[PDB]
Structure 1
Amino acid sequence: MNAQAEEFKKYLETNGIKPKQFHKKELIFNQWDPQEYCIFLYDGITKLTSISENGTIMNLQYYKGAFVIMSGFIDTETSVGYYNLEVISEQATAYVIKINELKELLSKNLTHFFYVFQTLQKQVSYSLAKFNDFSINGKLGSICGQLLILTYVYGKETPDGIKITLDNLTMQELGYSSGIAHSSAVSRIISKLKQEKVIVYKNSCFYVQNLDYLKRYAPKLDEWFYLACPATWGKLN
């Protein structure tokens, strides 16, 4: 839980905005029926995806509650882009706010205006950092960068390293995060990381045994976790 997010929850429920329950594989919004929302993901795990005319899947970013995703601009109320927000956890809870009423809610209470503005600053800096590390070292650095992200957010200390508490993280789903189209390619990069004793693919889960190696290929992301998520970062250093 988070303090600012819990007071925001009590603010929405006080104004008539009630929760909605989504189950795994469900889409809160999608790229084909654009509706300008403000998704306040309170509990659950989701991934922001995009599918091209070709049909290639792109895993842009994972979201873990509580956070704020918006599919439309605040002043114009027009689409910011055509993306899908798929629930990947077994169940998730979110507060769907029509883009228009949100304008009023934040106008009344500034404490929650700056909270939404803060998470937005977390998004901007996160995208620049992620874009920085994925671009420099090619696909190896992109797999290493993504595994660094998941290690901080879904990683727990274990005797065999640091286990990633994320189910159904197939080879395809890792490639989609780094723009790899073939599972055989992402698998090749994993084999190299196993031979270098960086990770161990024990029973359909990844165990990170050499965090410093990943920090080598994603310095701006580790820097971001330290500067933006100091609590999540400190629990592994």
Structure 2
Amino acid sequence: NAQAEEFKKYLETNGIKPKQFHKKELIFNQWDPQEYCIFLYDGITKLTSISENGTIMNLQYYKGAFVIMSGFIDTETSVGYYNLEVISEQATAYVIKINELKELLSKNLTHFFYVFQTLQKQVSYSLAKFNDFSINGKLGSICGQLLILTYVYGKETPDGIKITLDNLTMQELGYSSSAVSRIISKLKQEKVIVYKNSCFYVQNLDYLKRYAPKLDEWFYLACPATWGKLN
């Protein structure tokens, strides 16, 4: 969608050129002292964290049109020690040094507001996930994850709502852990979801909405174009 399309144009007129990235590649890593503003234009990515013994923790997933910042704009100090890994086959992104971003948004307030809103989206998304987790536990978390998958990559055809994520990206969010299985197993049993033609389908959406009401509220409030397509 568009506010982001205007930003892409803005960055290009200001000399920031797009860069191509592939699967498993890192846009930025934990140890990089250079702080950035990553305008992920197209693709899917994950924000990871490496514990001191080396175990990799998946923290957040971002889709292609979004901003990710490893530095604070005011102080230009690290927001945290993270890695921004690419998950999709290919991804396009504009890598900007945190200090240029300061200037680009200073010059242009429409874009300052766009990036500012994205943070507001991030904050509220987290609170929505958390609310649903607090009420329904792991069930709320899963339905929530399935609901975002549904709205963002779903389209209606005879056999329910098809998740159009290349199953290779869904192996990074498994078809296949086992209380998840207790849940995912139950959802298959109830005909809420179905695994038939190497794709996951959704046959009971009202159910997902029921057990992920705050996330459902978030989509409607944060990005209403996407929410309206299935409502």
Change in 2 beyond 3 A, CA 1:217/1:53: farther
Q: What are the Cα deviations for residues 53-106 of structure 1, in whole angstroms up to 9, with x where unaligned? A: 355544333211211111111111111122222212211110001001111111
Change in 2 beyond 3 A, CA 1:195/1:21: same
Q: What are the Cα deviations for residues 199-226 of structure 1, in whole angstroms up to 9, with x where unaligned? A: 1122342111111111111100000101
- Take 1:169 and 1:139, find their aligned partners in 2: how far apart are those partners? 24
Aligned mate of 1:211, from 205, 220, 229 = 205
CA positional deviation for 1:131: 1.5
Number of paired residues?
Answer: 231
Q: Secondary structure at the match of 1:28?
A: strand
Whether the 8 Å contact between 1:74 and 1:99 is mirrored in structure 2 is yes
Change in 2 beyond 3 A, CA 1:170/1:103: closer
- Take 1:196 and 1:56, find their aligned partners in 2: how far apart are those partners? 36
Change in 2 beyond 3 A, CA 1:146/1:76: same
CA positional deviation for 1:30: 2.0
Whether the 8 Å contact between 2:43 and 2:92 is mirrored in structure 1 is yes
1:70 corresponds in structure 2 to 69
Q: What are the Cα deviations for residues 159-185 of structure 1, in whole angstroms up to 9, with x where unaligned? A: 21111122246887447999xxxxx44
Whether the 8 Å contact between 1:194 and 1:200 is mirrored in structure 2 is yes
Whether the 8 Å contact between 2:73 and 2:98 is mirrored in structure 1 is yes
Change in 2 beyond 3 A, CA 1:32/1:135: farther
Which piece of structure 1 moves more, 202-211 or 72-81?
202-211
1:199 corresponds in structure 2 to 193
Change in 2 beyond 3 A, CA 1:56/1:159: farther
Change in 2 beyond 3 A, CA 1:62/1:98: same
Equivalences for residues 221-232 of structure 1 within 5 A:
221-232=215-226
Whether the 8 Å contact between 1:36 and 1:71 is mirrored in structure 2 is yes
Normalised by the size of structure 1, how large is the TM-score? 0.89
Whether the 8 Å contact between 1:59 and 1:176 is mirrored in structure 2 is no
Which piece of structure 1 moves more, 63-72 or 132-141?
132-141
Change in 2 beyond 3 A, CA 1:110/1:74: same
Change in 2 beyond 3 A, CA 1:77/1:20: same
Whether the 8 Å contact between 1:175 and 1:186 is mirrored in structure 2 is no
- Take 2:123 and 2:160, find their aligned partners in 1: how far apart are those partners? 31
Whether the 8 Å contact between 2:88 and 2:169 is mirrored in structure 1 is no
- Take 2:110 and 2:77, find their aligned partners in 1: how far apart are those partners? 25
Q: What are the Cα deviations for residues 114-143 of structure 1, in whole angstroms up to 9, with x where unaligned? A: 111111111111111111112321112211
Which piece of structure 1 moves more, 219-228 or 73-82?
73-82
Whether the 8 Å contact between 1:49 and 1:58 is mirrored in structure 2 is yes
CA positional deviation for 1:189: 2.0
Change in 2 beyond 3 A, CA 1:96/1:11: same
Whether the 8 Å contact between 1:171 and 1:186 is mirrored in structure 2 is no
Whether the 8 Å contact between 1:22 and 1:87 is mirrored in structure 2 is yes
Q: Percent identity?
A: 100
- Take 2:47 and 2:93, find their aligned partners in 1: how far apart are those partners? 15
Whether the 8 Å contact between 1:140 and 1:189 is mirrored in structure 2 is yes
- Take 1:131 and 1:35, find their aligned partners in 2: how far apart are those partners? 31
CA positional deviation for 1:34: 5.0
For the aligned residues, what is the CA RMSD?
Answer: 2.4
